[PDB]
Amino acid sequence: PAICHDGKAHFPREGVFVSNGTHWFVTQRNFYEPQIITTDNTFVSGNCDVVIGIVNNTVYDPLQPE
Amino acid sequence: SGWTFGAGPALQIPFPMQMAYRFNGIGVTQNVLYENQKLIANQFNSAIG
Numbered sequence: 767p768a769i770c771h772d773g774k775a776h777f778p779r780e781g782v783f784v785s786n787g788t789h790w791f792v793t794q795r796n797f798y799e800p801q802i803i804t805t806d807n808t809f810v811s812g813n814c815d816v817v818i819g820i821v822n823n824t825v826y827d828p829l830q831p832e
Numbered sequence: 833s834g835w836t837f838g839a840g841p842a843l844q845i846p847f848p849m850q851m852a853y854r855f856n857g858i859g860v861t862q863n864v865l866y867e868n869q870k871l872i873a874n875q876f877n878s879a880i881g
């Protein structure tokens with residue numbers, strides 16, 4: 767249902783979170799289009815302490831490296 | 833399978849995710865359900881009883 771990067775939750779803006787066997791992507795609900803999970807496709811809401819089934823993962827920041 | 837079996841082949845999906853998408857279909861985002869799951873389930877059980 768959600769992704770827990772660093773003490774926070776991360777819900778998809780549109781689509782579902784999937785993983786083949788090792789890496790997590792976010793994709794649409796009618797066509798398999800995997801994408802790299804960044805801060806643009808997810809919105810933070812919560813504290814990551816009430817959600818059930820949340821995995822940790824590592825999200826990507828597209829601004830700090832540049 | 834939600835409503836996905838009304839168009840083509842049935843696709844499995846966890847019930848909480850389907851409920852979250854139904855809530856998102858009326859303008860309320862997913863975090864409301866993902867943080868009030870227990871309360872909503874209790875209310876639904878009380879109503880169905």
Ligand SMILES: *[C@@H]1O[C@H](CO)[C@@H](O[C@@H]2O[C@H](CO)[C@@H](O)[C@H](O)[C@H]2NC(C)=O)[C@H](O)[C@H]1NC(C)=O
Binds near residue numbers: 877878880881
């Ligand atoms: C919710 O489901 C549970 C089963 O997982 C029901 O539990 C039993 O249901 C029978 C049938 O009515 C009752 O006679 C038992 O007393 C129930 N036991 C417990 C521990 O609840 C439960 O009735 C269901 N709830 C409702 C409102 O239908």
Ligand SMILES: *[C@@H]1O[C@H](CO)[C@@H](O)[C@H](O)[C@H]1NC(C)=O
Binds near residue numbers: 786787788789
């Ligand atoms: C799963 O997706 C990742 C994405 O980088 C890929 O490297 C990998 O080969 C895919 N398959 C498996 C079995 O991990």
Ligand SMILES: *[C@@H]1O[C@H](CO)[C@@H](O)[C@H](O)[C@H]1NC(C)=O
Binds near residue numbers: 821
């Ligand atoms: C996520 O990381 C925290 C600390 O880094 C850890 O306590 C927690 O167990 C991790 N989540 C899972 C599902 O292992």
